[PDB]
Every structure is written in C-alpha cells, then in structure tokens.
Design an enzyme around this catalytic site. Structure first.
Site, PDB file in Angstrom:
ATOM      1  CG  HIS E 112      -0.855  -0.467   2.407  1.00  0.00           C
ATOM      2  ND1 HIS E 112      -0.573   0.389   3.456  1.00  0.00           N
ATOM      3  CD2 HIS E 112      -0.846  -1.722   2.892  1.00  0.00           C
ATOM      4  CE1 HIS E 112      -0.398  -0.347   4.531  1.00  0.00           C
ATOM      5  NE2 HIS E 112      -0.555  -1.611   4.212  1.00  0.00           N
TER       6      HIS E 112
HETATM    7  S1  FES Z   1       2.914  -0.002   4.305  1.00  0.00           S
HETATM    8 FE1  FES Z   1       1.373  -1.468   4.982  1.00  0.00          FE
HETATM    9  S2  FES Z   1       2.406  -3.371   5.091  1.00  0.00           S
HETATM   10 FE2  FES Z   1       3.959  -1.971   4.450  1.00  0.00          FE
END
Ligand code: FES
Ligand code: HEM
Ligand code: HEM
Ligand code: HEM
Ligand SMILES: C[C@@]1(c2ccc(Oc3ccccc3)cc2)OC(=O)N(Nc2ccccc2)C1=O
Lengths: 377, 240, 79, 78, 147, 60
Positions: E112
C-alpha cells in the site's frame, strides 16, 4: 426469564428441558445422546485433523504421521478420532438393539430415519478409513468399492465412475476426503429430523406400555443421567486412546501403498465383520453383495414382522431367548468375518448366515404368534 | 510355505499400563540403527531433533547429525552440493529409487523403518525374536539359493542375513554388546521410533484414571441426589 | 410435541415425596442392592446366557478343528 | 578353564541367549519335542531323495524353549 | 479436564516441527557492486542488504532523534556506518520493502504505502516500528554473516 | 461449635457469586497440586527417564 417464548430457546426447552419423558427409561436409552456426543466428537477432532492432513496420494500417509509426530498433540486428536469411530458404532449397535428388543421401531418414521442415519455413518466411516492410504485402507477401499460392480448391466460404468478412473487411485482419495467432510454435516441434519419425529410421540420405555400417566421432565433427571453416561462414554474412549491406541487398528495400515500387492489376510475393521461374513458365506458375486445389502436393509422390514400383541419383549420369554440367539449369532458372524475362508469356518459361516435371516424373517415372528396364543389373546 | 510360529513373552520395562521407556536403552538402540541397520534400512520419519528430547543432548544431537552428508538445496548456478549435517532431518537414505535396494540385496526389499506396530503383529517381540532367533534349516527343505532361514518370519524362509553379534559397540556405559543386549536395545529404540508419544500418553492415561476415579463417583452422587425424589416417592390410590 | 398439562387423564392418586436435601442418595446401597442384582440376574440368565455358551462352544471347537485340520496335520504320507 | 581366558572368553565373546537356550533346550516339554524332532529328523535321512519336510516338528520345539527363555532371560540383560 | 483438552486442541494450531534454519549464508560484501541490494532467507524471511556508498553515508550521518517514535542514528544503529545489515518484512502489515525506490534513504514498502531509509528505521507512514535486522557482525572487512 | 460443611455453606456456597468464585479459585490450585502430585507418582514408578539420564552430561 422465559425459555418458553423466545423463538429459539423454545426449541431448546421443548427438546431438553420440559420435554415430558418416561419416569422409567433405562440406561439403554442413554445411547441416542451418546450418538450425538459421538457425532460432535468426530466433528471437532475430525476438523483439527483436516487442518493438517493432505489429500494427495503421495503425502497422504505422510501427513498423518506428520500429525502423530510433529503437530502438537496431533496423536491424541488422531486417536480420539479413530477410537471415536469405533465408539460411534458401538453406540449404533446398542441403539438399534434397544429399539428391536423394546419394540421402538413401531415409531415408523423415526426408525426409518435411523436406518438412513445408519447407512450414512457407515458410508462416512468407510470413506474415512481410506484416507491414510495404508494397505488396508487401499485394499478395503478396493473390496468395498467393487461391490457395486456386481450390479447387472451398469455395474462397471458405476465403479469406474465412483473411482474416476480404472481402479482406486488419486481421484478417489481426493473425493473420499471431500465426501467424508460433508457427510457428518448432512448426518447432523438427518439426526435433527430424527429427533423431530421422535418428539411427536416422545420416548418408549422398557415395558412397552404408555407412560403418559407417569411422565417426568427431561430436566434435572435426564440431564444428569445423560451427563453421567457421557462421562462413561469418555472413560471407555480414553482407555482406548490412552492405553490401547492400536488394538482395533490393523497393523497393515502402518505400511503405505501397494496397488500391486494385496496383503495375505485382509481383515475388516471390526464393525463390518458380521456383514463381511454374510457377504462371504455365499460363493457368488451377485448373491453375496445382495445378501450383504439385505443384511442391513432388513431393519426396515422389521416393523412388518411385528406379530405380538405386546410392544416390548419385557414380558416375552420366548422372544427374549430368540433375541439373544440373534445377538449370539451376530457375535458368531463377527468371529467368522475375521477368519480365513477355510474348512471349519465356511460352513459355520454359512449356517450363521441362514440363522440371522431365519430368525428375523421367520423365528421371531413365529415366537410372537405363539406368545399371543399362550396368553389367550 | 504357510505354516509358522508366534513370538515369546515380552518382559520389556514398557509393557505395563504405566511404563516409561528405558531412555538409556533407547540410546543404545539408536547406536544399533546408526552402525548396522542404517546401511540397509531407511528410517524416513525420524530426525536428529526428535532425539534431543529422548536419548541425547542439544549439543550431542548436533554432533551426531554432523557425521553425514545430505544433498542441500541449489544455489545461483542451479547446483546441488553436500552439507555437514543439520539437526533438522535424519534421513540417511541408503538407496535412491527403491529398486536400488532390490538390486543390492537381491530381490528382497529391506522394508520400513521406525518399526513395530508397523505390519508386524506382536510388534517388538516379533522383531526381537526374528533377529535373535536365526536357526539351522531342518531336513527335507532346501533354499532356492542360500537365501537365509528364519523360524519366525512368514514362510520360515527368505531374505536378510543374520546381522547380530558382529559385536559392534560404542555403548559408553560399560555395557557388553551381546547378541541379546543389542537386540533388546534395538527393539526398545524401534518402539520409540514408531511411537514417540508412548511416555506422555501413559502419564496422561494415569491422570485420566485418577481424574475419572474422582469424577465418576461424584457425578454419580449428583445424579442420585436429584433422583432421590423419585426413588423414594410413595404412591396411594384412593378411589371413591 | 406434547406438554405437561395435556398428556392424559388421571384421577385419585396421591404421590408423597421428599426433598433431596432431606434424604440419602445411597441409603442401603449394598444391603439392598446386591440382593437386587442377584435377583435380576436369576430372572434373566435362562434367556440371556444359553445362546452365548452355544457360541462359546462353537468358538472353541471351530478353532480347534482349524488348527488340527490344516497346520498340525500333515498326518500320514507313509512309504 | 582359567581367568585370563575368561576375559578372553569375553573377547572370544559371550553367552547370553546361548546359556539360557541351552538351559531351556534342556527341559521336559522341550526334550520331548526335540525327541519328536530327532525321530522325524531321522525318517528324512532315511529316503534322502524323494520326500517331504520337517518344518512342523521344529516349530513345536522353539515354542517351548523361547517361552521359558522370555520368562527367565531379561533378568540377566543389564 | 476441560482446559487440558481445550489447551491441547488450541496448542495444536501452533507451529509443529518448525524450529527453523541455519542460514548465515557465506556473504562476501566487498564483492557485490559499489552499493547494490542483496536478499536471502534466515528462516524463510527476506533479509536485505545494500553496501553503503560515500554520498549515501551522510544522508544517514544526518539523522534526527528529537522528532521520532523509536530511538537511534544510522551510524549509532549498526556497528559500522558504511555497512548496514537489514531484514525485510515491514512492521505495519507484512509487505516486503523494495530496494531504494521511495524517498529518504531508499526503502519504500508499497503493499500500500510507507517509507524507510538506508538504515531501515521508519520515518514517514503507517508502520509503527523500525524493522529488525539481528545484530550486524561481519568477521573481517571482506567477509560477513548476520547476528 | 457449628460444623465444617455448615461454615463452608454460610461463607461460600449460599450465593452463586461466591460458589463460583470458590470453584475457580479451587481449580487453580487443584490443577497445580494434581499435576505435581501426579507427576511425582509417574516418576517414582518409572526412573529410566530423560531426567536421571541427563545428569551424566553437563559438558557438551
Ligand atoms: S505499508 Fe502497509 S504493510 Fe507496508
Ligand atoms: C539391524 C539390527 C537390523 C534390524 C533391526 C532389521 C530389522 C528387520 C526387520 C524387522 C525386517 C522385517 C521382516 C519382515 O518384514 O517380516 C527386516 C527385513 C529385511 N532386512 Fe533387515 N534389519 C537390520 C539390518 C539389516 C541389514 C544390515 C540388511 C542388509 C544386509 C538387512 C536386510 C533385510 C532384507 C533384505 C529384509 C527383507 C526380508 C524379506 O522380506 O525378504 N537388514 N529387517
Ligand atoms: C467433521 C466431519 C469429519 C471430518 C472433517 C473428518 C476428517 C478426517 C480426516 C482428515 C481423516 C484422515 C486423517 C486420519 O486418518 O487420521 C479422517 C479419518 C477417519 N475419520 Fe473422519 N472426519 C469427519 C467425520 C467422521 C465421521 C462421521 C466418522 C465416522 C465416525 C469418522 C471416522 C473416521 C475414520 C475411521 C477415519 C480413518 C481413521 C484412521 O484410522 O486413520 N470421521 N477423518
Ligand atoms: C446419527 C445416528 C443416531 C442418532 C444421532 C440418534 C439420536 C437419538 C436420540 C437423541 C434419541 C432419544 C432417546 C434415546 O436415547 O433413545 C433416539 C431414540 C430413537 N432412535 Fe435414534 N439415533 C441414531 C441412529 C438410530 C438408528 C440407527 C435407529 C434405528 C435404525 C434409530 C431409531 C431410533 C428410535 C426408534 C428411537 C426410539 C426411542 C425409544 O424407543 O426408546 N436411531 N435416537
Ligand atoms: C472401516 C472399513 C469399513 C467401514 C464402513 C463399512 O460400512 C459398513 C459397515 C457395516 C455393515 C455394512 C457396511 C465397512 C467397512 O473400511 C475399510 O476399508 N475396511 N476394510 C475392509 C477390509 C476388508 C474388506 C472390506 C473392507 C473397513 O473395515
């Protein structure tokens, strides 16, 4: 507050709390709730075994050992499952015997549902046993499956169909895992339907005489009677799991796969012995499997052969003797089913087979008729 | 051909209800698998870690594992080398594709591994009596080739050369590696290889009878209490 | 199902009963129980027991014949 | 006879199963089976070409021996 | 009896054989180019390492502790500055961070979105902890291990 | 001088609160005392453990 109004607890109350039940039901009546406990037992342990078993031909036998050696407490869970399957049959047997002796089969629907429940669990245990892909698992799977091949005209398309090939192989182990997982949920539904039909009249009792003049509430009485009896089912189950894990378990399933080599003397599990003897008795393919089916399918003819003016066998000395001769005959079939097809044994095995049917189809009904006459009824 | 005899009577020190294993005898027994049986029989389900619990020590287990060479995973070239010996996967496998064991031994396939319970009725005894009971082939019967004769076994005849009394030893202790003593130990150990849970189970098992012996009488008394009311109730009919 | 209050008609019977906390749960457990089991045993042995000794007798004979007939056998082949 | 050769008897190697087998091989029901064997052992030497086996008469003997072997043995082992 | 059997059934869902690997892969890291990124497994769990180029040293020689959530300084983080030894999971969920693709140092967990650097410690997003690379011990300048 | 079971009833069983509190506190100790006392029984009858066997190797 109230158990009676809530759409949900009302079912509970009407099934386990206020249900009027005979003041006099015996220990023999404990088995139905023990069969329920068995089913739940099989369900829980079954499930946890499924979180670690794998259904492929290669790793099947192996994953089970992974459970018994590697997975925390898998051994105890695996043995409870195996020994739970035996207990389940022990209970079926007592439960079906109790119904015969006491005339309980006169509740047509609930008895007929019971037969279905019997066949369903037998189907279930069969698929189960094949799962670890041991020698007996494989050859037992081979024997039983081939019964269907006796069916005229469509016999072979059917076995090959159920195989998903040309013999018990890959495809069969996987489908058996699947059917073996869903069957107990389907059993559970049939059992609720079993319990529904039974409540329509309530329980029968040792005397075969209506107990509406002496009903007691299922709750304090059968609630505790059932608890006590569950603990007994548990002791007997643990004894096996914890002192005799391999006692009913054949040593040959501890050796993997041999579609090439059939063990010298293949021996059914235990609860199939009597039926195995009957199938074997008669030296015919078709007639053996027909005799085999009839050996179980006979329970549904039992109600047509009731001949006595009394329900239970409690006041029936003749029928009692013949009943035990039936039990003693089954015990003979069991002994014989676990023995080599040879000299003393085939003849004993054929005479016991005619006796089983001779006594159900003719002896019992004739005893009932002479007991009636003896009483001037 | 179809005739045969069954094993003697089992005084093991792991025969009774509650009955541990003589973990010292499990040691000696592994040594027997290590030096003798291993070169022919695969023990596919046991590992060096499994012993850590039972017969050896953390450090000892590593050391014994390090006395062999397995085929470790591939690296950048797409290789397949060998490695010192883990602690995480026994598996000294004497033969590749099983047929190689057949080629070597001549027909006969050196079976299973973590033995007894395995396909052998009278488990430990059958094995003990098989190894410890080789005897002269009596008159009237020859042996298609000098196969090897054994009174027990199915069909009294076939397969394995008598490999016990070639007094291999490394029992520390100060224990005489005699025929029998080496067998008692090998069966003992094989017992544990087939059933590692054996000792925990009977400790649980103890607790089950001990608990059951408390609960049974108690739950029974609970039921009698509640059923009192019915058991001692009295009836009277008083019609007009 | 059926409910207490709608089972059947009963007239003229009195039931006397005690509170559990007022009575014993095992009164004459042995004094009266043992005799009772002996009595239920007598009442049923003749019907239960015989078929089983009949199986028992066939069980021992049957195995006896099996052993003596096949294995033990090789009786005479004399020349 | 002699000590230095006893440890040599320990190096020439020792007795376990042998002393017990010998002592059991010795006994009542056993000598009877051995005797039944010895007799059948002869009737095959008789027609040493064309004839059966003596597997059975042998099995009977081990049965009696190994039985008392198991009872007595282990006490010596360790 | 109830918690004994419930525990056993519960304890059964915990790991089974798994008391993992040996790893310590013989790493030559004055072998790999000026500053390229390498990743192995130390129990099936990605361990990633870059070298530590001159220019790249100081982006981490200039830290900031007075505004953090977990404490350190790159040079103060590992044992030797131009030589760090990262793992590779991401304390947020479990999205393995990629080789120098985001902001600051290099790191940048997508799956994400979240940032890290050349020392690995988290500076921008959702992840709560610094990541973790056991110890750092080499053996000699030319060689190395891990922990 | 009342009796024991009476005391037990007055102070702890009358209310289902205390009744339940007493058994949970009863299980915590029973488990600990049963496991211990029962292990020692298992050990005393055996003694070819991994325990006694160990003693022999504080070294390596
Ligand atoms: S930014 Fe959510 S798991 Fe790495
Ligand atoms: C080492 C001490 C050792 C043991 C123990 C052992 C056991 C063993 C068993 C229990 C069998 C099973 C007999 C049966 O299946 O009913 C068996 C079988 C064979 N063995 Fe063995 N074995 C040990 C060692 C060795 C060694 C070192 C060899 C090779 C020279 C060997 C060989 C064989 C063979 C061949 C068989 C198969 C017998 C058959 O079915 O023909 N064994 N062993
Ligand atoms: C909840 C539904 C069930 C599931 C999910 C389930 C799951 C399993 C699995 C995974 C195996 C293979 C692992 C092993 O052999 O130990 C197995 C074997 C078996 N199960 Fe079930 N099962 C279920 C219901 C039943 C039922 C109803 C019975 C009949 C009482 C049953 C009796 C058996 C038997 C006999 C075996 C073979 C056991 C053996 O010897 O290994 N199980 N089951
Ligand atoms: C999953 C299998 C079964 C379950 C779960 C089950 C469950 C029950 C339960 C809970 C009762 C209530 C009282 C009692 O314990 O007797 C009962 C009664 C009964 N069941 Fe079953 N049973 C099963 C198999 C059978 C079988 C195989 C039959 C007959 C083929 C059968 C026919 C009856 C009958 C006739 C009664 C009548 C009660 C009586 O007369 O005393 N059931 N069962
Ligand atoms: C466990 C077992 C089994 C399970 C359920 C069965 O279902 C019935 C039980 C009683 C009567 C009719 C069917 C039958 C066999 O499954 C299995 O493979 N076997 N083994 C076997 C061995 C020889 C011949 C046939 C089978 C069973 O016993």
């Amino acid at each position: 507050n109230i158990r009676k109004s809530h759409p949900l607890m009302k079912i509970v109350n009407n099934a386990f709390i206020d249900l009027p039940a005979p003041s006099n039901i015996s220990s023999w009546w404990n088995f139905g709730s023990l069969l329920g406990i068995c089913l739940i037992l099989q369900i829980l342990t079954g499930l946890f075994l499924a979180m670690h078993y794998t259904s492929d031909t290669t790793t099947a036998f192996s994953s089970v050992t992974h459970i018994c050696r590697d997975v925390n407490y898998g051994w105890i869970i695996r043995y409870m499952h195996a020994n739970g399957a035996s207990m389940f049959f022990i209970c079926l047997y007592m439960h079906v015997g109790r119904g015969l002796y006491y005339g309980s089969y006169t509740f047509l629907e609930t008895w007929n549902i019971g037969v279905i429940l019997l066949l369903t669990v037998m189907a279930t245990a069969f698929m189960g046993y094949v799962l670890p892909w041991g020698q007996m698992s494989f050859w037992g799977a081979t024997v039983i499956t081939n019964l269907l091949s006796a069916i005229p005209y469509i016999g072979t398309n059917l076995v090959e169909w159920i195989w998903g090939g040309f013999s018990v192989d890959k495809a069969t182990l996987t489908r058996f895992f699947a059917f073996h997982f869903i069957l107990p949920f389907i059993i559970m539904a049939i059992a609720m339907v079993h319990l529904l039909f039974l409540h329509e009249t309530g329980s029968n009792n040792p005397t075969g005489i209506s107990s509406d003049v002496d009903k007691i509430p299922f709750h304090p009485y059968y609630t505790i009677k059932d608890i006590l009896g569950a603990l007994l089912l548990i002791l007997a189950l643990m004894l096996l799991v914890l002192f005799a894990p391999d006692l009913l378990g054949d040593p040959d399933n501890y050796t993997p796969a041999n579609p090439l080599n059939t063990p010298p003397h293949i021996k059914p599990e235990w609860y199939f012995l009597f039926a195995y003897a009957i199938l074997r008795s008669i030296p015919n393919k078709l007639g053996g499997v027909l005799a085999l089916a009839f050996s179980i399918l006979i329970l549904a003819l039992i109600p047509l052969l009731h001949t006595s003016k009394q329900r239970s066998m409690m006041f029936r000395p003749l029928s009692q003797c013949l009943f035990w001769a039936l039990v003693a005959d089954l015990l003979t079939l069991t002994w014989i089913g676990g023995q080599p097809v040879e000299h003393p044994y085939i003849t004993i095995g054929q005479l016991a087979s005619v006796l089983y049917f001779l006594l159900i189809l003719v002896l019992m009904p004739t005893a009932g008729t002479i007991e009636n006459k003896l009483l001037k009824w | 051909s179809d005739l045969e005899l069954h094993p003697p009577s089992y005084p093991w020190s792991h025969r009774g209800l509650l009955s541990s294993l003589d973990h010292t005898s499990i040691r000696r027994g592994f040594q027997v698998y290590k030096q003798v049986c291993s070169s022919c029989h695969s023990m596919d389900y046991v590992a060096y870690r499994h012993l850590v619990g039972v017969c050896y020590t953390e450090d000892e287990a590593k050391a014994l594992a390090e006395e062999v060479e397995v085929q470790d995973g591939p690296n950048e070239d797409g290789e397949m080398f060998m490695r010192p010996g883990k602690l995480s996967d026994y598996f000294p496998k004497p033969y590749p594709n099983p047929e190689a064991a057949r080629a070597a031994n001549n027909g006969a396939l050196p079976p299973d591994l973590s033995y007894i319970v395995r396909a052998r009725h009278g488990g430990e005894d059958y094995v003990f009596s098989l190894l410890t009971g080789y005897c002269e082939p009596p008159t009237g019967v020859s042996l298609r080739e000098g196969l090897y004769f054994n009174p027990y076994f199915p069909g009294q005849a076939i397969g394995m050369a008598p490999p016990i009394y070639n007094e291999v030893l490394e029992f520390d202790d100060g224990t005489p590696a005699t025929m029998s003593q080496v067998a008692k130990d090998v069966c003992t150990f094989l017992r544990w290889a087939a059933e590692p849970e054996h000792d925990h189970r009977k400790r649980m098992g103890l607790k089950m009878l001990l608990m059951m012996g408390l609960l049974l009488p108690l739950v029974y008394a609970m039921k009698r209490h509640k059923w009192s009311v019915l058991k001692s109730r009295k009836l009277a009919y008083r019609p007009p | 199902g059926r409910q207490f209050g709608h089972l059947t008609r009963v007239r003229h019977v009195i039931t006397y009963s005690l509170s559990p906390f007022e009575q014993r749960a095992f009164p004459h457990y042995f004094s009266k129980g043992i005799p009772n089991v002996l009595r239920r045993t007598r009442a049923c042995i003749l019907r239960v027991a015989p078929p089983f000794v009949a199986f028992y007798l066939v069980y021992t004979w049957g195995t006896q014949e099996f052993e003596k007939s096949k294995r033990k056998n090789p009786a005479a082949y004399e020349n | 006879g002699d000590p230095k050769e006893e440890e040599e008897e320990e190096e020439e190697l020792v007795d376990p199963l042998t002393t017990v087998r010998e002592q059991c091989e010795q006994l009542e029901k056993c000598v009877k089976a051995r005797e039944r064997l010895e007799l059948c052992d002869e009737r095959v030497s008789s027609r040493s070409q064309t004839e059966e086996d003596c597997t059975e008469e042998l099995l009977d003997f081990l049965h009696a021996r190994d039985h008392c072997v198991a009872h007595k043995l282990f006490n010596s082992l360790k | 009896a109830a918690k004994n059997v419930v525990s056993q059934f519960v304890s059964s869902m915990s790991a089974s054989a798994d008391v993992l690997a040996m790893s310590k892969i013989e790493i030559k890291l004055s072998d790999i180019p000026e500053g390229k990124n390498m990743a192995f497994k130390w129990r099936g769990k990605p361990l990633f390492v870059r070298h530590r180029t001159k220019k790249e040293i100081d982006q981490e020689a200039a830290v900031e502790v007075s505004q953090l959530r977990d404490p350190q300084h790159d040079l103060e983080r590992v044992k030797k500055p131009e030589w760090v030894i990262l793992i590779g999971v991401c304390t947020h969920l479990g999205c393995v961070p990629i080789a120098n693709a985001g902001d600051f140092g290099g790191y940048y967990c997508p799956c994400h979105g979240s940032h890290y650097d050349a020392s690995g410690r988290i500076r921008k997003g959702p992840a709560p902890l610094n990541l973790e690379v056991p110890s750092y011990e080499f053996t000699s300048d030319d060689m190395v291990i891990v922990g | 001088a009342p009796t024991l079971t009476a005391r037990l009833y007055s102070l702890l069983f009358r209310r289902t609160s205390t009744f339940a509190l007493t058994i949970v506190v009863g299980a915590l100790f029973f488990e600990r005392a049963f496991d211990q006392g029962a292990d020692a029984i298992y050990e005393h009858i055996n003694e070819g453990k991994l325990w006694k066997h160990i003693k022999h190797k504080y070294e390596n």
